[PDB]
């Protein structure tokens, strides 16, 4: 197979409570502290420069942000599935919706997602550290 065929999985660790982003088979998105959870293994695929999509390996669904700010995961990629990936001062990344460019992927400290319209650049909720899934 040509280069890039097999995608290297990653975890996304949210600084706000220390949860790994989790994508469930039914499309729900939340966080968990169990590093052995099969549903936290993600593929971060580079799309255009500085933009990624985020796929749950086991759920086989793409992270998307809906026009009402809700986070969910869908089986087929749409324009709601693309995020600007920006490196931050504390070595974490942020993921900002390309379709709705004031809104970020984010978790509350309960482990539930934070509505996109409530997010913003200074929040702990939007900070994710890519980690090895090995």
Binding-site residue numbers for heparin are 16
Q: Which residues are annotated as a binding site?
A: 16
Q: What is the largest CA-CA distance in the chain?
A: 43
């Amino acid at each position: 197979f040509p280069p890039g065929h097999f995608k290297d999985p990653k975890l996304l660790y949210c600084k706000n409570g220390g949860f790994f982003l989790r994508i469930h088979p039914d499309g729900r998105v939340d966080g968990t502290r169990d590093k052995s959870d099969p549903f936290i293994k993600l593929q971060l695929q580079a799309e255009e420069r500085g933009v990624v999509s985020i796929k749950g390996v086991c759920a086989n669904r793409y992270l998307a942000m809906k026009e009402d700010g809700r986070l969910y995961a869908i089986k087929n990629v749409t324009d709601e599935c693309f995020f600007f990936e920006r490196l931050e001062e504390n070595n974490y990344n942020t993921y900002r919706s390309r379709k709705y460019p004031s809104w970020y992927v984010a978790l509350k400290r309960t482990g539930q997602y934070k509505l996109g319209s409530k997010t913003g650049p200074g929040q702990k909720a939007i900070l994710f550290l890519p980690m090895s899934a090995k």
